[PDB]
Amino acid sequence: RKIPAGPYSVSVEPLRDGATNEVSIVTPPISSEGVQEYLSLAPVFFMALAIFTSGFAIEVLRFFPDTRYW
């Protein structure tokens, strides 16, 4: 990598000979284990927990408006 390219690059080395019929997939090389690990992050996990709790409260308020059963 003599050409200065950023880390985690899906770019082929720009120092190539005559036109190459090569396969260079421009899509992130993500991993299922990596994706699951990322969605288990404290920010992600706790924001998902907060969203779930908020939505559960929303549905309880919708189907049981006010505190009618106090």
Partner 1 sequence: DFSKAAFGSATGLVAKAASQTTTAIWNLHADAHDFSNSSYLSKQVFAANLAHIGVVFIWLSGMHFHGAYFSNYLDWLQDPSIAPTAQQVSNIANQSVLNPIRVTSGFFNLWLAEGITSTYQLKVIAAFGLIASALCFLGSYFHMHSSTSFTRVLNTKLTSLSTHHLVGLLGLGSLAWAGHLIHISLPVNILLNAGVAVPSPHSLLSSKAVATIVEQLSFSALTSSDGYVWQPLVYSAMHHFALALVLIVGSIFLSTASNPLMSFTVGSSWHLVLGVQLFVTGTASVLYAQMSNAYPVYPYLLTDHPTVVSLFVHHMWIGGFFLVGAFAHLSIGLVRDTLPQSFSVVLTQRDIILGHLTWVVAFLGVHSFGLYVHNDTMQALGRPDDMFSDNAISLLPVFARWSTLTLNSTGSAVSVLGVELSTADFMVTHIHAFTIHTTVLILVKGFLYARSSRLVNDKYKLDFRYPCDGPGRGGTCQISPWDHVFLGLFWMYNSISVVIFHFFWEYQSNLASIKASAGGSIRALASDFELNSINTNGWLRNFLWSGAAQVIQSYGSPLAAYGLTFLASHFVWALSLMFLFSGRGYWQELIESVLWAHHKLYVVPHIQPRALSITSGRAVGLTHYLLGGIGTTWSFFLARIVATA
Partner 2 sequence: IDTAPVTKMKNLKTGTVEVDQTKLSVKSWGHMEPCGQNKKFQKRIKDEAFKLKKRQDKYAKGSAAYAGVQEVIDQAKDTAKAYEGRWCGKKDGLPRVIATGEVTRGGIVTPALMFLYTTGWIGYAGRSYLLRTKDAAKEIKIDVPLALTCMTSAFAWPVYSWQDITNGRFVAKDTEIRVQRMHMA
Q: Does 52 bind partner 2 (CB under 8 A)?
A: no
Alpha-carbon distance values, 57 to 39, 45, 52 (Å): 23, 18, 9
Between CA 9 and CA 26 the distance in angstroms is 9
Candidates 13, 41, 54, 64: give the one binding partner 1 (CB under 8 A). Answer: 41
Taking the C-alpha atoms of residue 4 and residue 14, their distance in angstroms, rounded to an integer, is 10
What amino acid is encoded at 33 in this protein?
E
Which does residue 18 touch among partner 1, partner 2, ligand CLA, none (CB within 5 to 8 A, set by kind)? none
In the complex, the smallest distance separating the C-beta of residue 30 from partner 2, rounded to whole angstroms, is 17
Binding residues for partner 1, rule: CB under 8 A, are 3-11, 26, 28-31, 34-35, 37-38, 41-42, 58, 61-62, 66
